[PDB]
From a paper:
A hallmark of all motile M. xanthus cells is the accumulation of MglA-GTP at the leading pole where it activates motility, while MglA-GDP is found diffusely in the cytosol. This localization pattern arises due to the GAP activity of MglB, which is located at the lagging pole where it inactivates MglA-GTP and depletes it from this pole. The ability of MglA to hydrolyze GTP is essential for motility regulation. To gain insight into the structural landscape of M. xanthus MglA, we determined the crystal structures of MglA in different nucleotide states, which uncovered that MglA can adopt three conformations: inactive MglA-GDP, active MglA-GTPγS, whose structure had not been determined before, and an unusual conformation combining inactive and active features.
Next, we determined the crystal structure of the M. xanthus MglA-GTPγS/MglB complex. The complex contains a symmetrical MglB dimer and one MglA-GTPγS molecule, as previously observed for T. thermophilus MglA-MglB complexes. As in unbound MglB, the C-terminii of MglB are disordered in the MglA-MglB complex. Both MglB monomers interact through their helix 2 with switch 1 and switch 2 of MglA, which display active conformations, with one monomer establishing additional contacts outside the switch regions. The MglB dimer does not insert any element in the nucleotide-binding site and does not interact with GTPγS directly. Overlay of unbound MglA-GTPγS shows that one MglB monomer would clash with the arginine finger loop, a conflict that is resolved by a large lasso movement of switch 1 (11 Å at Arg53). This rearrangement positions the arginine finger near the active site, which it could reach through side chain rotation, and it completes the canonical coordination of Mg2+ by the conserved switch 1 threonine (Thr 54). Thus, MglB recognizes the active conformations of the switch regions and contributes to catalysis by reorganizing the arginine finger loop through steric conflict. The organization of the MglA-MglB complex is surprisingly similar to that of the complex of the Rab GTPase Ypt1 with the TRAPP complex, a yeast RabGEF whose central subunits have roadblock folds. The slow spontaneous GDP/GTP exchange of MglA was not increased by MglB, indicating that MglB does not function as a GEF under these conditions.
Numbering used by the authors: 2 to 191
The structure:
């Protein structure tokens, strides 16, 4: 994290982790679209010609005030696709909370597994334990006809019972509720 007693502001880093085309940038775009122009910064998206995230998406939220503190939440999304691992692992610099965006398509349940595993590897290499970090999981793409059932998707991705939220990113369903969950967890009085 980062406290600023003299400035009276709190800064936290949240990272959306997930395989390719699983909806991280979509989460952030929807968030930016429905946030008052007063409490949000510009949405930066280091993307390629194809619209896939090339380094990261970054979105600040000058959100409300804690016990008088300013509170600023820094949303990040990684490149996700496999061959950008080099860059992906960099986004977890001073990560304070994680959101795992799982693609609920059946074809990409394997890639979901691989991406969660890459997540654990990269956090450990960064000096973080996935079970120790505040982290939430999202089951994106709940609008598809053959989207894997929520239960059978938890069995494969959520053995430890961390908060799960079903979402349809483009529409925004589940998006802000996911962000709220991650934020409430990140706010550590411990
Ligand atoms: N069917 C369905 N498609 C979705 C949903 N959310 C996002 N998509 C689509 O999937 C594609 C991937 O979205 P995108 O936002 O680029 O994912 P990403 O995680 O940022 O992809 P990357 O950065 O790892 S490469 C987009 O074309 C988007 O429209 C959803 O909830 N349901
Ligand atoms: Mg993206």
């Amino acid at each position: 994290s980062f406290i600023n007693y003299s400035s009276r502001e709190i800064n936290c880093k949240i990272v959306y982790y997930g395989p390719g085309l699983c909806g991280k940038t979509t989460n952030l775009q929807y968030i930016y679209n429905k946030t008052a122009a007063e409490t949000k910064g510009k949405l930066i998206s280091l993307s390629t010609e194809t619209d896939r995230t090339l380094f990261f998406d970054f979105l600040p939220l000058s959100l409300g005030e804690i016990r008088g503190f300013k509170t600023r939440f820094h949303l990040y999304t990684v490149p996700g696709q496999v061959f950008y691992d080099a860059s992906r692992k960099l986004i977890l610099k001073g990560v304070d909370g994680v959101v795992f965006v799982a693609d609920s398509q059946i074809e990409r349940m394997e890639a979901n597994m691989e991406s969660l595993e890459n997540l654990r590897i990269n956090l450990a290499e960064q000096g973080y334990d996935l079970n120790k970090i505040p982290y939430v999981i999202q089951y994106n793409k709940r609008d598809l006809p053959n989207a894997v059932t929520v239960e059978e998707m938890r069995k494969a991705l959520n053995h430890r019972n961390i908060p799960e939220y079903q979402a349809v990113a483009p529409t925004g369903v589940g998006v802000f509720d996911t962000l709220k969950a991650v934020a409430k967890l990140v706010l550590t009085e411990l």
